Amino acid sequence: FLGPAVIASIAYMDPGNFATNIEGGARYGYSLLWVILAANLMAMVIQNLSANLGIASGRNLPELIRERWPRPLVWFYWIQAELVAMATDLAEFLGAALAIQLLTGLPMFWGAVVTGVVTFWLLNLQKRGTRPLELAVGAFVLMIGVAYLVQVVLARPDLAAVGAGFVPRLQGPGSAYLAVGIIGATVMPHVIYLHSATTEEKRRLVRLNRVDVIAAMGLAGLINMSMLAVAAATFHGKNVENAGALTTAYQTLTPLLGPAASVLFAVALLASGLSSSAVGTMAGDVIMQGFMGFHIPLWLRRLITMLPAFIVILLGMDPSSVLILSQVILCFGVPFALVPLLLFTARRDVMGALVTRRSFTVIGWVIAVIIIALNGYLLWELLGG
Ligand SMILES: CCCCCCCC/C=C\CCCCCCCC(=O)OC[C@H](O)CO
Ligand SMILES: CCCCCCCC/C=C\CCCCCCCC(=O)OC[C@H](O)CO
Ligand SMILES: CCCCCCCC/C=C\CCCCCCCC(=O)OC[C@H](O)CO
Ligand SMILES: [Cl-]
Ligand SMILES: [Cl-]
Ligand SMILES: [Mn+2]
């Protein structure tokens, strides 16, 4: 009876999580372990409210905004929700193109051209054809996740710094830019618009969906913490050339995977980016339909999302660096998504007999308060550091 939360863990591991966990351990050691533990517990409460909203109300967060809020406010949220989709695909479409570079040696541009063909072709496939591929990409992402669960024990990390990595201690502005990037990688604001896509029958799924969320977020947190702790035991404190970048993250699993660490890491990173970008493009289409009632052709949405990725490549920026930036932008979109979440789930005309418990609503606002604080904390040091 164990399986649903495995699927959610492999779907949660996107290239955005790889870039933040590897860089978080290489440049800052274990000192960001508390960020991963805090973001997961935040995402447990956040993604639980997102699922409770869809079971009771029957609609999704975009649909409720379209039917209840004034038009100028619906357009603003649709534009805000449209930028969260572009920042999500920018982390996944670029991650697949980066894995192509680690496998074949193709440049970043041509690696995106191959990623562009796969993303276009994968959208035309039906639900019955992608079923084997969903298990194929699930296999590689799962084994690479258990690889870090075993290696974190075999790497023999300095437990004095591991346990001390759970006290919220700051390391300047660079720690905040990356701590914010970890929150955006875990919460995933676009899911807050996507997850939601008879109290005996409606509180039944709230009992069933709640089990899958807490169990899956548990392993995803263990995998993310293990990956950050292995990268800390590998590159941190040793002055490695270009440490933290995804071009050398395979060396974290060299003593475990032997000479197969580079291929098994890029393949698991390619399967993670190809699946999350095709599903992310499908998710962005339902979001626009919920806000505006109409939609653009899916090929046009797929092409517009590639333009910022090709522009970053044509400029010469570091692929691993722009993946972390996209996760920071997502964390600025979390407060904009939590507000329609904490308000709709706390209305009796919207939920019915499933009004959110008064304790979870207050905690959810404090989570938004902390993220607003952490976003406001960061946003100062950039221009006056
Ligand atoms: C901060 C990180 C927090 C999360 C981290 C905990 C997660 C570990 C859970 C399961 C993996 C256990 C599997 C590891 C078992 C390997 C032991 C073994 O096989 O021993 C081989 C060694 O070579 C003989 O000396
Ligand atoms: C769900 C996982 C997080 C739950 C909350 C975590 C509590 C923080 C304490 C220990 C971390 C667990 C790993 C144990 C290794 C660290 C133990 C330790 O504190 O080491 C003391 C001394 O420094 C040795 O050298
Ligand atoms: C350096 C300091 C930086 C920190 C910066 C922020 C400081 C915190 C300010 C306000 C927190 C307010 C706590 C949130 C309480 C909201 C509870 C609530 O509104 O829930 C009611 C619900 O509607 C019932 O049905
Ligand atoms: Cl450290
Ligand atoms: Cl309302
Ligand atoms: Mn993520």
Author numbering: 43 to 239, 249 to 436
Provide the publication's sentences verbatim.
Transporters of the Nramp (Natural resistance-associated macrophage protein) family import divalent transition metal ions into cells of most organisms. In addition to the physiological substrates Fe2+ and Mn2+, Nramps can also transport toxic metals like Cd2+ and Hg2+ but exclude the abundant alkaline earth metals like Mg2+ and Ca2+. Recent bacterial Nramp structures reveal a LeuT fold, three stable conformations (outward-open, occluded, and inward-open), and identify the metal-binding site residues, including conserved aspartate, asparagine, and methionine residues. We present high-resolution structures of DraNramp in three conformations in both Mn2+-bound and metal-free states, providing the first molecular map of the entire Mn2+ transport cycle.
